[PDB]
């Protein structure tokens, strides 16, 4: 069991986008580069294609916390768009072994 205070949280997008862009994700703590989209983290679409568009990235989050993370529209470069106003949040639990978490980021 690694850091019991850190939980991996996957941020998934409900977005059937079809462009060559990518939805990155930054956060309210250094874990997500503090608040930089070019330092945040690009997400992937392994569970997103046509039937169910679900992006997501399991960005670790050390020290239980109602972290506040949001999405960003990142072009083939660091140019992007970002959180509307109401960003998202996650509460890192204190479970040893099952260090998993969830954050439903919507992009569509």
Instruction: Report the alpha-carbon distance of residue 70 to residue 68 in Å, rounded.
Output: 7
Domains of the chain: 1-108 (2.60.40.10)
- Give CA angle at 50 (18, 53), nearest 5°: 80
Q: How was this structure determined?
A: NMR
Q: Are 24 and 80 in contact (CB under 8 A)?
A: yes
**What is the separation of C-alpha 33 from the centre of its chain, rounded to a whole number of angstroms?**
12
The 8-class DSSP code of residue 29 comes to: S
Q: Contacts by 54-57 with C-beta closer than 8 Å and gap 24+?
A: 54/12, 54/13, 54/14, 55/11, 55/12, 55/13, 55/15, 55/23, 55/105, 55/107, 56/10, 56/11, 56/12, 56/13, 56/105, 57/10, 57/11, 57/25
């Amino acid at each position: 069991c690694t850091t019991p205070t850190a939980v991996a949280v996957t941020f998934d997008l409900t977005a059937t986008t079809t462009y060559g862009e990518n939805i990155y994700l930054v956060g309210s703590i250094s874990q997500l580069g503090d608040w930089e989209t070019s330092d945040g983290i690009a997400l992937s679409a392994d569970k997103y294609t046509s039937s169910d568009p679900l992006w997501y990235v399991t960005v670790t989050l050390p020290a239980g916390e109602s972290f506040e993370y949001k999405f960003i529209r990142i072009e083939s470069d660091d140019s992007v768009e970002w959180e509307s106003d109401p960003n998202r949040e996650y509460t890192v639990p204190q479970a040893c072994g099952t260090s998993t978490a969830t954050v439903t980021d919507t992009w569509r």
